Amino acid sequence: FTSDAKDKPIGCSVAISTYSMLGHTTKRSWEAERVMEWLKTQEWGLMILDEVHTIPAKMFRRVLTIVQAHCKLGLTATLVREDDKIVDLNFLIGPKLYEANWMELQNNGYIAKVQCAEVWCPMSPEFYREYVAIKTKKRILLYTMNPNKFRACQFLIKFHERRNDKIIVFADNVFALKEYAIRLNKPYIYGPTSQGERMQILQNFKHNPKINTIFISKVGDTSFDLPEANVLIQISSHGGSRRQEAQRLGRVLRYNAFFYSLVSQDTQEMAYSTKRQRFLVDQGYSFKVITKLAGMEEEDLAFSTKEEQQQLLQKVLAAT
Amino acid sequence: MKLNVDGLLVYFPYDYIYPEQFSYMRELKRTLDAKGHGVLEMPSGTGKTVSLLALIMAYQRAYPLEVTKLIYCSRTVPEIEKVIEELRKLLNFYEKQEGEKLPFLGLALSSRKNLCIHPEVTPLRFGKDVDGKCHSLTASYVRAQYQHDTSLPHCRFYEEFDAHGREVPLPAGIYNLDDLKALGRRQGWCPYFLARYSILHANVVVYSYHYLLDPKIADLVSKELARKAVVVFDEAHNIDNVCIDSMSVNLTRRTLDRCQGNLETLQKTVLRAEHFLGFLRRLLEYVKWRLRVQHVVQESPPAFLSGLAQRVCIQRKPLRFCAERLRSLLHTLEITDLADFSPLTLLANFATLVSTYAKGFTIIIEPFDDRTPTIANPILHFSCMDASLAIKPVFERFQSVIITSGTLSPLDIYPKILDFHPVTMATFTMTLARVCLCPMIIGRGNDQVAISSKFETREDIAVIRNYGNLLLEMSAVVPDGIVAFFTSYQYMESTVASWYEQGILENIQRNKLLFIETQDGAETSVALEKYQEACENGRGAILLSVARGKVSEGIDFVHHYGRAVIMFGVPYVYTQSRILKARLEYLRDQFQIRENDFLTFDAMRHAAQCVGRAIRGKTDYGLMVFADKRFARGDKRGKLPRWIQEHLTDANLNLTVDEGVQVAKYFLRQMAQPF
Amino acid sequence: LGMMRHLYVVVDGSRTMEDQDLKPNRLTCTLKLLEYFVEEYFDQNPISQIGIIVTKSKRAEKLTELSGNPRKHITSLKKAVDMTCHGEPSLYNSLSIAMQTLKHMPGHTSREVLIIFSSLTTCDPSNIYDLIKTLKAAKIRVSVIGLSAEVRVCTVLARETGGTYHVILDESHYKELLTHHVSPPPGNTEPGLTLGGYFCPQCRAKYCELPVECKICGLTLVSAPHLARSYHHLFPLDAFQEIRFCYGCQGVCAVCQNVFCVDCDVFVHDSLHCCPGCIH
DNA sequence: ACACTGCGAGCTCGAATTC
DNA sequence: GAATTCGAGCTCGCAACAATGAGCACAT
Ligand code: SF4
Ligand SMILES: [Zn+2]
Ligand SMILES: [Zn+2]
Ligand SMILES: [Zn+2]
């Protein structure tokens, strides 16, 4: 029931639809109107609500009054969510039945042994000159487009391309997605790309031993078909979303595999990156700290001189 | 194994059935109790044949008054013998389970050249030759002096048949064609006239299409056999092409110049009736006058019969009995062979078809030779447009008639062309323990160039290289046999001889041998026996052929022969022939079928027939690429049937050449491993 | 328990050995696990042999002759990393070279060929199906490990001669396939025990620190402790019935009637393989 | 007496944070 | 409490669609 296929949805046994289609509060199309008139009058059994942690939103909880079901199963992976509405979910669906022990599944082989490592990078002395001078949201670019964080991304990509590892660089703040992925000549699912080249960049990543990295931006924050990565160099994501860094971790466990978390130290991202490990240390995961990488200065890394570093600050500060 | 469908006790000859195969017997019982037709699509060749026979043969035991006889029209003589061997396996299972004998006989019918004992006539190669020399010994004037029983030529078996073969019938024991010759050998009877006599008292009867849908045959053999029967048209994709060619004749300059010799020999024998020879001499010089013109193509299906009464003054009331009196004239003339008058019977069959059948017909006279500006070669086609004019006896006479194949591509086209209304019109999909097929649509080339075989996109070497770069990179990752169907023969020549001038055909012969399937049957069977030898020893081969060919319909590519099947374009017919350009003008007014929705329907039933040849069995796996850009469109990949469409995902829909290899290289590695 | 074995290892050297989907060189990842395979073969099988044949450009060239030398094989696989590997392989020329020597071995052994095979095509100048009637007559046991696909010959060569055909999932499956080819399937030779450093008694020839055969007089020289580990499988010790002060550690046998504790009981059957009271 | 399928606009949400 | 940033899915207008080849079974 997803507005493109509509495999005669009137009169079936299993209907696989989405949120915001059953709760679309505008004037619906005519093909969706005759299905919703059929779906509002049949008593179901076992509604399966995938990604339960978005149900206590204002528009996604009106689905449970439109559709009449006897029992309602809810399957999720990251039950934590901000704004304190997970306790509100105890009467929309019911009591929490089973939570899997995230370390018992690792010791038995059902989940890859993840070696979390919060490698943090120092701040450049030219960038910290303007970081403490402004407060109104322009410094989010400054702790994201750090030149000393650009080296630790380029070094960790090189260090795992020589081990034949499938690299995913999750990176929000889409201006710095472009300026990271064109200075390393790597593909990027920018997010407003298409439905077409989103499907072939993702397929050139799996069944091809030449294309090795990929620069997603806020797309893989759900149960998408990201094809079994091996490392995950997460750079400068959303603020304190401990739901996010348990969904970025979901790509890795699908040491064996290990994901990083690039932090520009002595900035506001240091306080953020301990809010997001607050859920993962309650499952058993241990976040190491890599203050200095294993020989970063010896290879051919970008932004060596200060002349090429002065041009990057004039590109960042020109946005405003 | 006592298997219970909705009301019946079906005795299945196996142990494990497939979960879809129970619904095939369930949906076929839904036709027989409703006494109506049915268009069922069912993928496999065997398994479908033994589940259709397990139900209907068990249906006539519980309701022996509603159905009495099962007619099973198969394509040709190999599948005629295959169905009967699937019936002994069901009968002998019933012999073990019940321990008794039955009044149950099943036959098989074919031509006189498949049921023949007489030694002077059996090694005759052509089928029209054995019909004459039999008629030289079995005609009613040859037996006229055999009431004296002299030493004058005859058939030993035919005179021994009608003296003893009418009193006692065949008791039991399902007969092949070889069993009917063996029964005819040790008894001394004719096999052909014993099978045609006992076809009225049987329970399963397996012959070809042309005993039932051919109008000048079906009134002689299947006239008074059964009014409450069950007809099954097995492997019935090209019912439309069979009912057209059965009511379409072709006349040219070579045929009509031979009819003047037949009228010459008929003039020497009358002096040794006379109005009928002047009748035919009048008609022959009119059709020669109509082919005498060198002008534009023209069509006039009832107006031919008006101008035939102007210059010649011959009406349609004596013209309707033209082919009847010519059959009567050769009987009273006592001629030896009748294959020599085959041009004159073709003119007599043409004369009785213009007179009676003119609703959806045409006469297309083409003085313009194909592809050449001015070459003297005229031909008139009497082409039938309406494919429902040869089943109107069959859809009416019998009780329930079922049209079953494996690749009925839209199920709502076949009740639109053929004027009938089914009661089920169902489709099915085979169950699998793996993904036994990996269909992909390899679209754009390796340098993002479109790959399609249009008519303008054939000369440029940016596409011929991208076909050669595909067959090269699939011949290194596919084991033991690749079948590459091209769209035509002049495109197979102009691509293979343009791969050779580049450095592409040199690198394909390093991996696999390549065996071109040519038009003549002598080189083809040589190149096919070496192909199946090369797939069995180490090297592997490539049988590159033509989609509208002999190998595409007859030869079945079982496992490790043709692991991959490569379609080098959408196999369209010539879409500018004046016959096809006139049939589509009849399919637009009648039935309101769009002109473009029929050319793609015709192409997606020949591109899904030969691709579906790669998988026949339990453990058979097989790659099937579709190497054209136009296959990705919604009105083309939505046609090809639901058992090869439920594995064609959206990722394998515009794959490039190098990306299509790593889907294939991962698929064959996964299939190579045990269950 | 097991028998003697004369294993050959046929290694593919085609154009397709330059392929990816493995550690840097497909050829290199083959030769990496083969050096692991020669070590574990000679450890569990003391007096067996290994030949290594490499097929390349429609011809087979013998890399190492058939000898029980667990050093000469690994020092030759390190050399063959820089091989050219051009052309299409053969399978008639490689199994016949592995038949001119392996046929004349005595019949008390288990003569075997193991083909590691990456190419899909065996361009060979004769019929392969007469070898499979010949190799089945000579009681050879040909088993193939296939790469990336399943070929019809390698199924009928395996199931008629008696071996196995297997296709690789990945490198963790490729090590699992070579690990299953070290266990022997269920006469009197004359070896020479090499006491005094490493010298040969029969010809008194001094050479290197090896369990290898002697070239000067043809005798095989084994070391008796290496033969000694294969004992205790035959006539092993029967278990005890168990219902303080011990006899093993001094802090019940049905033979010597001396009690044990629990640590001692598990230790006798696991590692010591003899009863400490029974040796007295 | 012209016109199929992809593909970007608005529209309205959610998640988490500034303002 | 009212914005932002960047994502989502659902409607729905918009612009323009296409279609080239070759032969044996069956009745007196
Ligand atoms: S009459 Fe009988 S024997 Fe004679 S040609 Fe016909 S089938 Fe053969
Ligand atoms: Zn010696
Ligand atoms: Zn003891
Ligand atoms: Zn003790």
Side-chain angles (χ1 to χ4, degrees), chain C residues 200-205 207 213-221:
Chain C
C200 158
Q202 185 64 60
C203 46
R204 294 295 184 178
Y207 55 89
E213 47 67 27
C214 183
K215 54 177 189 298
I216 293 193
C217 76
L219 207 58
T220 78
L221 304 200

Side-chain angles (χ1 to χ4, degrees), chain C residues 240 253 255-256 275 277-278:
Chain C
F240 312 116
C253 189
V255 194
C256 56
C275 182
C278 294

Side-chain angles (χ1 to χ4, degrees), chain B residues 8-231:
Chain B
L8 208 65
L9 264 295
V10 173
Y11 275 7
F12 210 83
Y14 290 88
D15 173 79
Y16 183 51
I17 72 151
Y18 306 110
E20 47 89 15
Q21 206 176 12
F22 185 77
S23 45
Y24 184 80
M25 287 177 289
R26 175 151 43 185
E27 282 280 341
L28 200 150
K29 199 208 176 307
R30 197 167 272 101
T31 81
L32 302 183
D33 57 354
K35 284 197 261 185
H37 314 324
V39 193
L40 298 149
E41 165 201 323
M42 178 67 203
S44 168
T46 185
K48 174 189 75 178
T49 313
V50 81
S51 65
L52 192 148
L53 276 164
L55 176 71
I56 302 183
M57 186 187 158
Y59 194 89
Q60 68 183 43
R61 268 71 169 270
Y63 306 87
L65 306 180
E66 299 197 320
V67 299
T68 49
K69 178 177 302 182
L70 163 76
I71 307 178
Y72 200 109
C73 294
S74 298
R75 272 204 152 189
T76 183
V77 196
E79 307 99 350
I80 292 172
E81 288 277 301
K82 200 156 185 173
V83 168
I84 284 300
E85 286 316 290
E86 300 268 330
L87 193 57
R88 309 174 93 109
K89 209 172 303 180
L90 181 62
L91 189 66
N92 294 154
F93 158 73
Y94 200 88
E95 292 293 284
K96 185 251 167 189
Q97 184 63 256
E98 297 284 324
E100 315 164 7
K101 305 282 282 295
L102 301 170
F104 184 85
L105 74 160
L107 295 147
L109 266 295
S110 172
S111 299
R112 277 157 172 165
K113 72 177 183 182
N114 296 1
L115 297 177
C116 201
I117 320 184
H118 187 78
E120 296 82 1
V121 73
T122 178
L124 269 73
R125 310 156 194 171
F126 287 86
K128 55 195 181 301
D129 305 358
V130 73
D131 300 3
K133 205 152 191 172
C134 174
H135 196 277
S136 164
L137 305 165
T138 64
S140 186
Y141 48 85
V142 172
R143 311 199 300 160
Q145 68 262 8
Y146 210 68
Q147 322 287 109
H148 309 263
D149 274 306
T150 60
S151 278
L152 216 53
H154 64 97
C155 178
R156 162 212 161 196
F157 309 98
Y158 181 48
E159 311 274 3
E160 284 174 346
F161 170 66
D162 45 355
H164 311 88
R166 273 86 159 87
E167 292 86 3
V168 52
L170 312 181
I174 319 289
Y175 300 107
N176 279 261
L177 293 186
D178 309 60
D179 199 7
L180 280 174
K181 298 159 82 171
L183 169 63
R185 195 83 44 85
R186 69 173 172 86
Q187 191 37 71
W189 289 344
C190 159
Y192 182 72
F193 286 127
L194 176 73
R196 200 198 277 199
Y197 162 70
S198 83
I199 208 177
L200 319 176
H201 311 298
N203 292 137
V204 182
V205 174
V206 183
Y207 42 68
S208 66
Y209 282 149
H210 307 275
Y211 289 84
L212 197 59
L213 295 174
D214 200 351
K216 69 190 307 185
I217 300 184
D219 54 354
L220 318 174
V221 53
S222 45
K223 175 66 185 63
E224 293 177 350
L225 62 80
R227 311 281 161 233
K228 34 176 63 178
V230 168
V231 182

Side-chain angles (χ1 to χ4, degrees), chain A residues 73-175:
Chain A
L73 169 62
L75 309 163
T76 173
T78 81
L79 205 51
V80 284
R81 170 218 161 87
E82 313 286 331
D83 318 319
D84 198 330
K85 286 176 184 177
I86 300 302
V87 60
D88 177 278
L89 194 140
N90 274 329
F91 50 87
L92 305 186
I93 291 187
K96 178 176 178 184
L97 286 179
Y98 184 81
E99 176 150 36
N101 202 328
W102 273 44
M103 277 301 115
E104 202 175 350
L105 312 187
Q106 184 178 284
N107 299 148
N108 296 16
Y110 311 121
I111 276 173
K113 192 171 55 179
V114 185
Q115 186 212 5
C116 318
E118 188 211 344
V119 45
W120 64 56
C121 318
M123 203 81 167
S124 177
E126 197 57 46
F127 272 61
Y128 212 88
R129 178 64 207 93
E130 282 286 271
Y131 179 84
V132 287
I134 52 179
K135 303 294 279 295
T136 56
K137 214 187 60 192
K138 267 74 157 185
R139 76 185 198 272
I140 296 186
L141 281 173
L142 287 182
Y143 72 79
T144 300
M145 202 64 211
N146 206 342
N148 290 268
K149 202 206 294 177
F150 197 91
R151 296 213 206 183
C153 174
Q154 191 185 14
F155 177 75
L156 282 174
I157 280 176
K158 286 187 176 186
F159 181 56
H160 302 97
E161 275 191 352
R162 298 163 182 168
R163 298 182 42 168
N164 264 17
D165 268 348
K166 285 301 180 181
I167 312 179
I168 289 195
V169 187
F170 268 105
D172 301 60
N173 191 20
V174 309
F175 166 68

Side-chain angles (χ1 to χ4, degrees), chain C residues 210-268:
Chain C
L210 305 184
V212 306
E213 47 67 27
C214 183
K215 54 177 189 298
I216 293 193
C217 76
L219 207 58
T220 78
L221 304 200
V222 305
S223 65
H226 204 115
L227 295 174
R229 296 178 192 159
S230 285
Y231 293 76
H232 91 275
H233 290 298
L234 57 84
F235 39 95
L237 179 82
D238 50 319
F240 312 116
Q241 57 89 28
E242 282 287 304
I243 169 165
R244 295 182 175 291
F245 50 97
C246 182
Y247 197 77
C249 57
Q250 200 180 0
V252 184
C253 189
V255 194
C256 56
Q257 294 76 235
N258 299 315
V259 310
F260 289 144
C261 55
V262 73
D263 297 350
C264 291
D265 189 0
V266 57
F267 177 66
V268 175

